[PDB]
Design a protein around this ligand. Structure first.
Ligand SMILES: [Zn+2]
Ligand SMILES: [Zn+2]
Lengths: 118, 119
């Protein structure tokens, strides 16, 4: 079930892989792990892997005490699904700026973030 | 608000036997899972609303329980026009498009929403 899928995502992150789910019934692609397709409700789903290339769909800045900020955002992957992620600003972050996935260790476990690219 | 803060308020409303959801003021999208940006249009201009808790079964599956039985897990479409995942209690037999209403159950000192079929 669901709890297992979540666990699996952690395994994939550890391998520097960005998983997502594709529904074999209706074709819908979605990141947040569920055992039924959120679009059509099918249980006939499979884990696929994204190349990790995308763009900033939406973003907001969340400031820190030193004046710096973390970027909360939605990234649209080229495979045609979106996910929430923090975004590391190397080049200037704007709407539709290109980003790529990068896996960072957070309290001992790797998670996907996105970094702006040139 | 921060996402964490919205989630905390969701817990509060569960305790009050209320089913919250979010509506986007920019694009009108309604969604249950708490986010600071609208998943459809990306806007931060969102508001928490409350559902009447009436819905229907959009999809469902039977999940094995290790006492040798099953439970129903599915997607419920609330009348307000958003969907959420939930366990579903069978007061009457569950099937697609059967009406349900929200109920609240305790898990480790926190109430959570689930649904039951209606008679
Ligand atoms: Zn589907
Ligand atoms: Zn919106």
């Amino acid at each position: 079930r669901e709890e297992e899928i979540r666990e699996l995502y952690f395994k994939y992150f550890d391998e520097n892989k960005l998983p997502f789910i594709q529904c074999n019934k209706c074709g819908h692609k979605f990141y947040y792990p569920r055992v039924l397709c959120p679009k059509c409700g099918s249980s006939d789903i499979e884990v696929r892997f994204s190349k990790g290339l995308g763009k900033i769909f939406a973003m907001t800045k969340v400031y820190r005490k030193d004046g710096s900020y973390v970027i909360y955002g939605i990234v649209e992957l080229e495979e045609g699904f979106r996910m929430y992620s923090n975004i590391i600003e190397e080049s200037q972050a704007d709407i539709n700026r290109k980003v790529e996935v990068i896996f960072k260790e957070i309290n001992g476990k790797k998670y996907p973030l996105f970094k702006t690219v040139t």
